[PDB]
Design a protein around this ligand. Structure first.
Ligand SMILES: [Mg+2]
Lengths: 76, 114, 115, 76
């Protein structure tokens, strides 16, 4: 499920996951209110609107769900 | 002004999780701790004369933050911006922090990373 | 608003020395402790969405507050004023505190007195 | 006396500072010893406050009084 727009990411959210959007930042958290996903506008070092992905323990993931520290900054 | 400002940029703080934000001692002192890998970067603002924290009303807190786990904390750093101002002949550093979902502005006398 | 305000007024807080002023937990919480004779009244503001602490530039601090003695602390209560606001449909208490030489403004979801 | 005559008879190495109609006076140990204050909700006049080396409210005669007492609020 990698190639989505932001609108379908927010619309296909899993079961129990809620989300909130404010000033162009989206926070999505799972049923445990754990932050799992964030969409952000560009900052100084990332110059593109990106997705952030986070496991059950808030670790950065890449497209493949593998834990990462670059690859953590996922276009959509 | 700018020595500290790009000394901050050399921390590579962008998108880092913030683990603690404390304003203590009658607003004299602000402590911000964010995680660099597994370690703690401390930002310390001392000699403060203005502390202005604004939390987004769109992000409703359903429990007191103190009862959040770090797993539940949303706060992360998006931009730290340093500046300089003078009010009635007092020169003060300013720092504006976009750490969604809140906005912070500090007029302080020193900024030091620990 | 006026229930909250006149429980506060019946504390007679005026000219009380303030012993502790804390804003903690990402600005979620404000703690203000002032002394009533030999007793301590705590005011607590929780579920805060705005905190504005302004210190007078005319009153220069010549060392860090933490190394002050309580005898050297200038801060005293002059006026506490409670009010009400709604922003994007969330209702919030507003508190303005004139604590010379500081001014405080807090937008919170609850205010509680303990002593 | 006026605010100027009180301030100018200040003791030893006592200093002072004025900000938005509050005057804070401290002794050589920087202990707050006196405040000149505008009226508030309960005290309807410009008053003086006086304090021993331990921040206790004093009256004109140097006796400790309850901070709440009218005697702590000394007109000029
Ligand atoms: Mg990023």
């Amino acid at each position: 499920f990698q190639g989505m727009t932001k609108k379908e990411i927010l619309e296909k959210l899993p079961e129990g996951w809620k989300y909130t959007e404010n000033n162009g930042f989206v926070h999505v958290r799972d049923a445990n209110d754990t932050i799992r996903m964030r969409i952000a506008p560009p900052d100084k070092v990332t110059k593109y609107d990106h997705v952030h992905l986070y496991d059950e323990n808030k670790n950065p993931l890449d497209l493949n769900g593998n834990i990462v520290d670059p690859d953590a900054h996922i276009p959509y | 002004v700018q020595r500290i400002q790009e000394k901050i940029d050399k921390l590579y703080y962008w998108d880092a999780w913030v683990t603690k934000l404390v304003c203590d001692y009658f607003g004299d002192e602000v402590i911000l701790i964010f995680k660099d890998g597994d370690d703690d970067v401390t930002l310390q603002f001392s000699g403060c004369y203005k502390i202005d924290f604004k939390h987004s009303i769109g992000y409703v807190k359903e429990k007191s933050i103190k009862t959040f786990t770090h797993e539940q904390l949303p706060y992360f750093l998006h931009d730290i911006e340093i500046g300089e101002i003078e009010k009635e002949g007092l020169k003060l550093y300013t720092c504006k922090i976009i750490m969604p979902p809140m906005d912070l502005d500090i007029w302080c006398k020193d900024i030091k990373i620990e």
